[PDB]
Structure formats: C-alpha cells, structure tokens
Scaffold this active site. Structure first.
Site, PDB file in Angstrom:
ATOM      1  N   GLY A 191      -0.114  -6.370 -18.404  1.00 18.35           N
ATOM      2  CA  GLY A 191      -0.188  -7.631 -17.680  1.00 18.35           C
ATOM      3  C   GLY A 191       0.305  -7.303 -16.230  1.00 18.35           C
ATOM      4  N   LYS A 228       0.827  -1.264   0.084  1.00 18.64           N
ATOM      5  CA  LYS A 228      -0.108  -0.006  -0.078  1.00 18.64           C
ATOM      6  C   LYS A 228       0.964   1.330   0.071  1.00 18.64           C
ATOM      7  CE  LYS A 228      -4.093   1.571  -0.536  1.00 18.64           C
ATOM      8  NZ  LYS A 228      -4.817   1.355  -1.906  1.00 18.64           N
ATOM      9  N   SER A 239      -0.662  -0.833  -4.472  1.00 12.40           N
ATOM     10  CA  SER A 239      -2.047  -0.103  -4.454  1.00 12.40           C
ATOM     11  C   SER A 239      -1.888   1.024  -3.370  1.00 12.40           C
ATOM     12  CB  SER A 239      -2.900  -1.125  -3.830  1.00 12.40           C
ATOM     13  OG  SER A 239      -4.194  -0.512  -3.488  1.00 12.40           O
TER      14      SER A 239
HETATM   15 CA    CA Z   1       2.033  -4.073 -15.752  1.00 11.31          CA
END
Ligand code: CA
Ligand code: CA
Ligand code: CA
Ligand code: CA
Lengths: 360, 363, 362, 363
Positions: free
Chosen positions: C353, C161, C231
């Site tokens: 990806g 995070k 994230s």
């Molecule tokens: Ca990627």
C-alpha cells in the site's frame, strides 16, 4: 564402444517437434538412443519464460508416444535443458544428443554423460547445498560418459531452478530465509552455485575456496567449461557432461576456448581450431557452437561504457545473449548457435566458455 | 579559404554530458565557433518515446550558446544536431563532433575529408514518407554537397540525416484537419520518414533515377536504395537535417572517409571492406579509426542467411533495438571497440536487411 | 502570513514549459514566488529515465531567463521533483507550488502550507543506509519549519526526490574501497526510497529511532510513514523534500488531507482521502487540485489473496505496473487520470500500500 | 430441450496448471464430458510472441484427453479453448470453465444462462482482417446462437472469440505466394483480426447492417461496433473459435449474465451497470459474481477524457498490455477482486477507447 551423434535442428516455435520427427521417421535417429536435448527457446530467457516448459512438455509428449512409455519416464531418461532467450539474430533450435553402442574401430572422440540432482528447497538455491549436490552429479555424469581425466571435459551444460515470488513467500511462511529476495537475481545465484559445483567436481578450484559468502561474489573463482541456465520449469539440476574419450567411435569431436569478453572473436576462432576447424573453408563441419555470455560487473567492455546494467527495460542477460550470438554468428556465418546468458563463475567476469562440436 | 575538417569521437556519461567536449574546447583543440555538426548515440530506446535525443541536443545547444555568447536558437540554426537514440548491447554512448576550419594553408595532396550541412524546411505530418519529403531531402543533399565542396557524387561516402516521425498527438491533429498520414502507427512512421529521406539521398546522388520513385514505392520496393544514406528519426525535430561526408581535392584534412555496404546484419566482411576503403589495411592500422558509422535493420524476410529470428515477431523489444545491438556487436568484434555509431532501421539504405557502413580514419 | 497556491498543469512532453509560461504571462503566477514543482514525466520511472532531468533542466532554464538569474540559483531556490513513469492512462503533468507573503489575517482554522529543504549530496555507498535516514530526518524538520507547521499531525504528505546507483557509481565506490548497499541499479532505487521514507517517519515521530538500523531498511515492513512519498532518480545526488500540510498561520484557499491505501485496489482509501480534504460527495470532486499517491507491488506477490505477476515479470519492472494500477483506481474514483502516482512504496504505508493525499479548494 | 450451464472460475499457478480443474473433477463437481469451453487468462505478454496461450491449451487438452479416454485431437474439436494472454497489473491468472448438459427440468422462471459454441474454417493469412473473416465469423456466431438456444440477439450478452494473427514467416510466405496481407506488421495484424471478427459478431446479431461493412471500414470506421463482442488473437490457431453467452427460456441454470459497455477505460459506472444488469444491486450481493469479462483498449485519440496518455507512443510497452492493466484495476477496485477476465484491443468492440463488459452471476 560409445558412438555419439549430434543433430542441430531448426525449430519454428517452442512446441515444434517436426524436425526431430523427420530424422526419426527416416531412420536417422532411433528415439530410444536420445540421451539429451539442448534447446534455445524463443521466450525471454528470464523468470517468466514459459517457452522452456512448453518445449520440454512438447518433446516429452512426442517421445513418450514414439517410445510407448509415459512422459514421466521420458523426463527421467532424457535430459531436457531448454535455454530461453533468442535475442538479436539468434535462431531458435534444438540440439539432440544420440548415444549408440557399436563395436567398431582412434584417438579421443566425442563422449557424453548425463546426471540429475535431487530437488532443492527454495532456501537451498545459491548455497553450498546446491554446490555440493551438483558437484557429485557432475562426477556422476563424467563416469556415465566414460571420461576419467577432467582435462577431457570441454563443456558441462546445466539447467537449474530459480525463485519465484510464490516460492519466496512460501519459504517465508515456513520460517526459512532465501539467498536473495529477488526473482531475477535468484537466477544468478542458482547459475553461479551450479557452476561452482562443476568447478568443484572437475578440480578447477579446491573445496576450501568455496563458501556461501563466495557465491556470486568472488569472480576469481570460475570454471572454464561450465555452462549453466535457470528456469521455473524444474526444481533440481540436470547435468550434461560433454568431452572426448579414447573409448569412443564417434565421428565428431568437441573443442573449446574461453571468451575473455563479449566481443572476443579471437576466442571463437580459438574454439573452432581446438575442434579441428583451422580455416574458413572448414566451417561447414560445425555441428553447433555452445557459449556463455554475460554483462561484465564493471559496466564496461574494453574500457567502453554500456548500459546493460543500467537498462530498466531490457534485462542484462537478454542483451548479453544478443551480443555474443552476433559475434559468433559473424565468425561462423550462421546465427543458429547456442548462446546462454548469465555466466556467474563461468569464464571470467564478463566472459564465458565457448565450445564447438565439429565433424572430423 | 581552405577547409580542414577535424573529427572528435567523445565518450559520454549521460545524454546531457558535455564534459568531454568542454575539455577539448578548454584545451584549445576545438574552437566552438568552427563546430558544424554533432552526431550522437544517446542511450534512450531509439524509438518513438526517446527523449534522450532532445535532451542531448538541448544540453549541447545551451553549452555552446553560452561559450559563444549567442542564443540557443542561433546555435541550432548554425550547427547540425543529429542524435541517434538506442545504445543496446555493448554499444557505447558518445558524440562525434565535426569541426571545419577555414585555413590559409594548401590543400592536401589528393582527396581528404570534407563535410557539408543543410537543413530542409519543416514538414507537415501528412508529408512524411511521401514524395514531398523525398524531393525536399534531395534538394538539401545537393546543397550540402556544395557546402562540402564535393562535385562528384562518387566522392560522397556517408549522408547522415535526422528526420521527423508521427506521434499519436500529431496523427490525431492531422485527422482533425482532414488529412491522411502515410501510416496510422507511431513506430512505423519512423520507417517511412527514414525511407523517404534515404530515397532523397539516392535521388540527389544519382544512385536511382527519379522515374522509379513514387509514393507507392516508398517502403515497398527494396530494390531501390542508397549505398551511403544513413537516416534516423526523432520526436525532437520537424524537418530533416543533413550531413554529407566525403572527400574533396580542396581539403586540407588529415582524415579520409571510406565505405562499404553490409549485405546483412552479420557481414563482417563489409566492415573490413569499409576499413580498407578508408586506408586501413591491417589490424595494426585500426588505431587510425576515428569512428565507424553503420546502418542496421531486421530483414523483411524474418531471416538471416536462411535462419529464422524473432526480431519482427517480438512484441517486447522493437526490431530496430535488436538490429542495433547485433550490428554494433559485429563491428565491435572486428575493430575491438564498441564505441561506434550504429543506427537502426535501414529502409532504402543498402539492401533489405543490410545497410551502409562508413569509416572515418586518419591518413 | 503565507498563502499557498497550487497549479496542476498538463504537459505535452518532458521539456514542455508552455502551460507554466501561460500562467506567468497571464499574471496568474509570479515566477519569483514558485517554491516547488512536482512533475510526472513520461520516461520509464526506473534507472535509465532521463525525462526527469530533461524536465528539470527545461524548467530551470525557463525560470532563470524569466527571473534574470542563473540556472544554478534557480535550482538552489526551487525544489524540482520529477517522478518518472506515466504508465496506463496516467497523464504527464506538473504541479507548481506558489507561496506568497500576504498581509491578510489568518483564515479560521488550518489551511495549506508548504515547506522545502534539501540535504547534502550523498556518496553512492551512503544510499539505503542510516546516514541517508538521519540526513533526511533533519531536512524534514527544516521543511516543517519553512512551512510553519509545528505539529506533525498537521503534515499530510512529505514528497521526496532521492538518488540511485548506476553501474558507474558502483564502480566509483569500489575504486574508493567502498561497498554499496546493493549491487543492482534498480534495487538501489528501493533502498534510497526506503531509507528516505524512514527519515520522514523518524522526523515525524511515526517510528522511534531505536527501531531503525541498516538491517531494517527494506526489510521490516512494520516500520513505515503514513505520509512519506519518495521517488528516485539519476538526475540528482541529494534528497529534496517538500512538506505539505495545514497551518493555523496560513491564508491559503486550499487544504490538504490524506489517507493510506491498504493495497493497490483500495478505492475506499481514495474516498477517505477526499473526505479528509473536505470533499464529501461526487459533486464536490471539482474542488480537487491534485491527488498524490504511492503505489507498489506487495512482497507477497498477491492482492487480497489473488496472485499477480508483478514481481515475476522480467519484461516490465514492478514499479511500472503498480503505477498503472493505482493511477487507474484513483482515476476511476475521481474521473480524471491526470493525478500524481509514484511507484515503489518501501516504508510508505504498509507492504503493498501507500499514502494518498488530496489537495482541494475550500 | 432444457440445458443447464455451470461456470467455474479457477485460479491457476502457471499456464500449464490443471490442478484446480482436476480438483473439481475428482470431487464430482465437474463431469469432464460436459465441459464445452474454457476461457483463460494466461500470463504471457498477450501479444504476438505469447506462447503461454498454446501452452495452456496443450496442457488442458492433454489432461482432458486422458481423463476422457480420447485423443487430444478430438478434445480440441469438441471443446473451445480460448486463451487470452496478458495478465498485467494485478490481473490474476485463471481459467473459466463452462459446463453444459441437458437436464429434465421444468421451465425456469424467466431466462437463465445459456452458452453456445462454434468454430470457423481456417483462414489464409491474406483473409485476416477482411470480409472473408467477417462473413465466416458471422455464420459461426449464428450457429453458436442456435447451439445456445438463443433466437433473440437481445438475449446475447457476450460473444467471446479467439482469432488468428500474422507472424513474419506467414507474411513472407504470403508474399512468396504472390498475395498481399491486410497489414505488413505482426502486432497490427492482431487488431485487424480482432476487428474483423468483432464486425462479424455485429453482423450476425443485427447490430450493424451488411451494407455498412467493407474491407475499407475494418479498423477505420469506429462508428461501427458490437456491444457484446470480445475478441482475442493468438499465434496458436488459424481459425476463429466462438463462445456465445446469453440467457434463454430453455435454460435450467442457476446463473444469469448481464452486460453494459464501458465508454472509456476508467468507466466504473459501466462496471456497476453490468453488475446491476446481472442482478447484483448492492455491494452485499457482490459474492454472487462468478466472473467479470471485459474488453479494454487505448483510444485512437491518444487521450482519456481529454487527458493525454502515452499508450500509443510507448515503444517499450505495447498498448494492449497497458489497457489490460488499467481496466482490470478499475474493475478490481469496484468488485474487490483482481481475478477477472480483461482482454485488450477492442477494435469495433464498444466505442473507440471502450469495450463491452459482462458479468456472470449466481441468481
Ligand atoms: Ca508500502
Ligand atoms: Ca563469466
Ligand atoms: Ca537496408
Ligand atoms: Ca472499442
């Protein structure tokens, strides 16, 4: 003598030509005398807004058949500037500019000029190539309008291109770098470069102050009359210069002010007064109000935070259009006015020009 | 003893920001034990999946519980937390904190600001948007009026309500229990909860007679409305919370409330009328504003003063979001400050396409 | 000796702690042994997603009261990584990592191991730049030690995070005389995610330090980690790291494996990740504890030569669309949409990806 | 009477892109006079305010009118234009062009692809979602079956329909005329139009008996559904346009169609079953796909296989947008190509939360 007539026409959808057709069929509009149509179309006003092209295609088809010419010739002859985004209470409509020659009898009255730029390569958007070509076209449009004094230009409306993922990737394949690798942000660079082109041509800023580095960075540099709007549906810039000239027989005038921020109702009232509307009772002389709106880079308005720049659901130009349209609507009592979002180098940071076309 | 109401409009940096309230408590301006209600604008989407409302209440309840040395559950039983989501356009997130002091001072001459609070029972999902919610809200509004020491409904100028909504999960549970809900749509359920709650206000205040209200009229007969009701819906509660705001002869407040009704979303005249009703007669006296509180909505006709808009056709942005942006911008342009309370969805709150607007002002 | 147990718990809302409370009240989880919680929360997963902070606040308040300690101490002890955005059919849930010291011997071979480390808070002008890369790399190595993993080849997923920029933080940086990496709040998430992922690659030896510079961040897609999953959120100012791998000094009854999705519809990579975690047939799918994957819109604007609108759509941001797509692909392979999918995969797998890991019972 | 159907799946660069079709016409691969239907995925939002559907139809009608030397009006009466908005996720914008001509051929081995087209009358707003739309659609489906030379409904594998919707202005007009519409919600009106249209398919094909269909069952009894109906709603038309696709003994086509029914949004097994029903039995035969056509939707329960999702609670993104992204991704992962047709909102089309899926494949 030049005579300009302007018709604000409500539309029921992007492809609705019925209101214009009514004015043509009644003899009020000779379609051969239309020089520009400025639209608010009800798409999202951002990258993937196809109501702009849908509206232009529909109008070009209709006028091509009325005039007995090809759609291609219509688009070369008439400026079609479709500003997407009709958020809040903003009412979709088109504004049709008609220019007639009549030799007849005071002061300065409404005058309009049109000019188009060359197509731009993707890697030219947001850079001096777009600035300088637009600046030339603005002068071109000023002459077409027979305006010699730049102080008599009260609104310069421009449609300009943007970058899609497809165009960025093609540029990538050709070994060229674009100004920004973001489709929505590319609209800001195109709008701002075009606006600096207006300021350059009009003498509002000297050429030595403009560079690729200043585009969308130096907010001290702005035009007080430029109004620019971006779209996927074209590759060049279309220019409409609107002002007043002593060699006009129009029964209309244009005035303007500059909104200092998105809630500047005083500037709306100042623009009305500059167009000769001095009291609420004279509000019915409005033909249209034309304004630019934007989210301020500070993320605040008059010291108060807002979420326009933090909101990942609704893009900031959509919110700015809703706000400024509501402010204007509350002053004039009519939400069917032209508000375009994203005012890079158009008025101050967080503000934008506002013009009023009014009956004398 | 004598009631003195103080009201603090506090800017917030996020839904969970308690720093502004903490500053006023730490400075001694607010005794937290005297807080009776907090009315918030929180920066979620203001619709079904807005969790900024619950986040804001949880954060405030935690903070106050620790300051008071009591449990969060006791705080929530004692203090109304009404979080209205959606801060579109330039609308500034903030909270309005209502503090009520008992003081051994005389009442002020005339009528001054008074506040009362009442909570309803929890509602079953199948009761939202129906007479059970209307009648229970009306009962609670009368209780809140008594709490405010207001006996004349003409002295009630704003009745702010938080009410529940239906989620897909609650609709499906209702279906399994063999119950039919008022509407099988989560977003539309907000309108029925808002509208039934507003009709409860109108019933309690005598604005409408009981014989005109039925399940069939709810969200259908727009001739029925309250001129002071302001209702707001959320996933974060199962009952209705009511704040009655008015003026009372038995108040020592240095504040008053006035109101008007916006006839439509661009009715700036109504903003000026509400300001005047609160004693603000010129632009120079607008520094006496504590807050402006208004309801906004998309008119069912799909138009404003004969002009079409897309609020009811726009599948990307829900209509209460657009209405909030519009009305906040209108108010902001009159008062010069976008940090005002605007809530969307005005079913039975003012006419169709309009909504009540109140002003709390210093005397 | 360490034993890691992992619990995938459905949630009814961002603040729902009931499923975790049930496992504690039943004796299945000792709350003092929780080391990390990785959540999917049902906000929009972008800048103005407050469900992430709501979920962390709710979990920290619950655990603090169960443990008789302060919320502040819980947040210093337990990693809380809340990944917003549950688009499409993706089911909100939390994955709780429990680590126990056990006297049992070492299970033959390698079994699940987890480590946690936090960085210092970053100034806004530091996001997306080498300072974030280098501090993350340091924390990843610390988390590897916490996990008792010495070989980077035994690291199969590094979940992070990281912060983002809001307009107000940009204004603060400007007021202090500083320029931020980008003046766009949503794009700042990509720079924070990407710098953090490059920090993972540096710590693990996936990329050499001399190839990384501020100019390469979010530009050179040849530089990427095959295990990083990052994230971003408004609810924190530092980076929190969870390293997940296998260790010889683990008594876990679980293992982790991974692959890399070459693009958003690469179901083969999902199957390869399952096989790497010991799941060799559809019938063994019941051994899944969770699947964790990164998803993104390719910069080319295409998938296998076919155009899509993810990067042109001004209504729905591209990380939202990528999450819906990849969750649906995984769900169709494993028969369960309650899997972890996070959007925005800058320097995490190839362009378009992202890494995909499977935690599975042995 | 032998008929040959050819089908061309054409990538598009924008809603108005006719260049791929022009290339096939200019090379002689398509005689434009033999086009009978075009089924499009257009990149608008696929909901109420999606004008890419009309933009695409206008652009195709203009182009074909000029190529054929006829008016756009005649093209629209001659060719079915069904534009399904919404290209979410990785779904690739494209058009599928159906060409049909009579040929002097012998009897094919077995049954081969056949297509038929029929249009209904225009509907009043108050007829949408009600038996008037059901029964008129059923009549047109039977007409299209005849056009396709299919007598046995078991040989119908996909019935693709475009149907109208309600806007705020049409709802308000109905109100002014003293009429009540099926629902006072523009987005929900799409579901009623889609669902009534799908029930018309089920009635025409004998999948459901007439005595089970009434206004009350529409969008309420999910036990009633067609296994081949695929319906799509739009502001750009006031009637229903029907394309029946199946196989017939009177076909000289080098193509076949097969189908299955996805039981839920992640049912990859049903995708493989549809491929197998179309003669594609291994991954190596996947190159015979011409297109895959599917319906997707959010289940009314708010779950997929017992797992909650937010599609029905999400006030930012409408549920048909989310369902399209999901099912397109599932199909794309099976066939290796996201340029397939997925339409959202599957009321009475497969079970609640599922939908029909067909494959057109080369033999
Ligand atoms: Ca990627
Ligand atoms: Ca500006
Ligand atoms: Ca109202
Ligand atoms: Ca279905």
């Amino acid at each position: 003598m030049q005579k300009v007539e302007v018709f604000r026409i409500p539309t029921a959808s992007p492809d609705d030509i019925s209101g214009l057709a009514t004015l043509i069929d009644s003899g009020k509009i000779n379609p051969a005398e239309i020089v520009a149509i400025l639209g608010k179309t009800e798409g999202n006003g951002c990258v993937n807004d196809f109501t702009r092209g849908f509206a232009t295609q529909s109008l070009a088809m209709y006028l091509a058949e009325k005039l007995g010419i090809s759609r291609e010739e219509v688009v070369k002859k008439v400026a079609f500037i479709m500003s997407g985004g009709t958020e809040g209470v903003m009412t979709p409509h088109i504004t049709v500019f008609v220019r007639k020659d009549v030799a007849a009898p005071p002061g300065k009255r409404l005058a309009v000029g049109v000019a188009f730029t060359r197509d731009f390569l993707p890697e030219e958007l947001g850079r001096m190539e777009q600035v300088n070509e637009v600046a030339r076209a603005v002068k071109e449009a000023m002459k077409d309008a027979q305006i010699d004094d730049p102080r008599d230009v009260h609104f310069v409306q421009i449609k300009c291109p943007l970058l899609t993922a497809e165009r960025i990737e093609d540029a990538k394949r050709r070994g060229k770098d674009v100004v920004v690798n973001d489709t929505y942000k590319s609209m800001a660079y195109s709008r701002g470069a075009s606006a600096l082109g207006v300021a350059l041509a009009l003498g509002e800023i000297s050429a030595d102050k403009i560079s690729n580095e200043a585009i969308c960075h130096d907010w001290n540099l702005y035009s007080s009359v430029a109004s620019t709007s971006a779209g996927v549906e074209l590759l060049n810039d279309e220019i409409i210069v609107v002002g007043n000239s002593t060699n006009s027989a129009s029964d209309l005038v244009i005035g303007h002010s500059v909104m200092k921020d998105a809630i500047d109702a005083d500037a709306v009232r100042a623009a009305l007064k500059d167009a000769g509307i001095r009291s609420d009772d004279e509000m019915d002389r409005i033909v249209n109000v034309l304004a630019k709106a934007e989210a301020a880079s500070s993320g605040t308005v008059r010291g108060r935070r807002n979420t326009m720049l933090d909101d990942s659901d609704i893009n900031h130009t959509r919110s700015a259009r809703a706000v400024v349209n509501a402010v204007i609507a509350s002053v004039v009592g009519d939400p069917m006015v032209y508000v375009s979002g994203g005012a890079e180098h158009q008025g101050p940071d967080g503000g934008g020009p506002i013009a009023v076309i009014a009956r004398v």
